[PDB]
Amino acid sequence: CQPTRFISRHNIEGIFTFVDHRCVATVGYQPQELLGKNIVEFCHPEDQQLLRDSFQQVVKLKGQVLSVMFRFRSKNQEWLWMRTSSFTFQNPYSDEIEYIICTNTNVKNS
Amino acid sequence: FKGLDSKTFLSEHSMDMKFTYCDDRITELIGYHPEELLGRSAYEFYHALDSENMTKSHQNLCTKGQVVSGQYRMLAKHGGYVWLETQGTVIYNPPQCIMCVNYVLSEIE
Numbered sequence: 001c002q003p004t005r006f007i008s009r010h011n012i013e014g015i016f017t018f019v020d021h022r023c024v025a026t027v028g029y030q031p032q033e034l035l036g037k038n039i040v041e042f043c044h045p046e047d048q049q050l051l052r053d054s055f056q057q058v059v060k061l062k063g064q065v066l067s068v069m070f071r072f073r074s075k076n077q078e079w080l081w082m083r084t085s086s087f088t089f090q091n092p093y094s095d096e097i098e099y100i101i102c103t104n105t106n107v108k109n110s
Numbered sequence: 111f112k113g114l115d116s117k118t119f120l121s122e123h124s125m126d127m128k129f130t131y132c133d134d135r136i137t138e139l140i141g142y143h144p145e146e147l148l149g150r151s152a153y154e155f156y157h158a159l160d161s162e163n164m165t166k167s168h169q170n171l172c173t174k175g176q177v178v179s180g181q182y183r184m185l186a187k188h189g190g191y192v193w194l195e196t197q198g199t200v201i202y203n204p205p206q207c208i209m210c211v212n213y214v215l216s217e218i219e
């Protein structure tokens with residue numbers, strides 16, 4: 001079976017700046033309900049600091065992949081386990097600030 | 111038993127709902143120091159079961175200018191939740207910020 005996943009881009013603070021419409025099937029929200037919000041706003045309280053620390057560290061890992069698992073609040077107010085794999089991108093023809101690219105998959109915690 | 115002033119605290123937010131100021135009264139009531147709240151959106155603190163209704167209230171604030179929240183839960187500093195009711199007011203200029211008067215309905219649960 002196809003795992004359910006969608007791509008997102010974030011600023012280095014965590015705010016959604018781009019959301020792939022596969023998010024509707026994965027977590028129930030339209031992209032516009034996520035754009036402009038920090039991903040931490042959808043995260044379980046027990047996972048929120050881990051998620052903040054993960055966004056902080058991915059910019060230190062020399063563009064390599066960092067993965068995090070956390071509980072994401074779906075459009076039905078239910079906690080769904082997500083596995084977010086993230087890495088930074090910076091175009092070497094520029095000195096513009098790096099941003100973060102994520103792939104977000106619903107996973108089992110078992 | 112606490113008197114009304116001691117259960118009430120003011121907060122200010124940018125239009126992104128991030129805290130920009132909070133009264134020190136919150137520390138005795140919910141455990142946060144105001145400086146640790148700055149830059150964080152109100153949405154980081156709503157109970158999941160209140161999140162959709164708060165999103166609707168925010169929408170209403172932004173269309174009407176002034177709204178009372180109804181009864182909702184804020185995540186407390188060391189875990190668990192406090193029930194609050196908030197009156198929100200947008201301050202528009204020449205929107206600039208949102209001013210909140212928050213009243214605590216419960217101890218930490």
Ligand SMILES: O=[N+]([O-])c1cc(S(=O)(=O)C(F)(F)F)ccc1Nc1cc(F)cc(Cl)c1
Nearest residue numbers: 123152155167168177178179184196198208
């Ligand atoms: O605009 N707001 O930031 C806001 C609106 C609302 S609202 O949109 O429901 C309202 F304006 F209608 F009240 C509610 C709360 C809050 N802020 C808030 C202040 C706190 F001290 C703690 C928490 Cl968890 C949230």
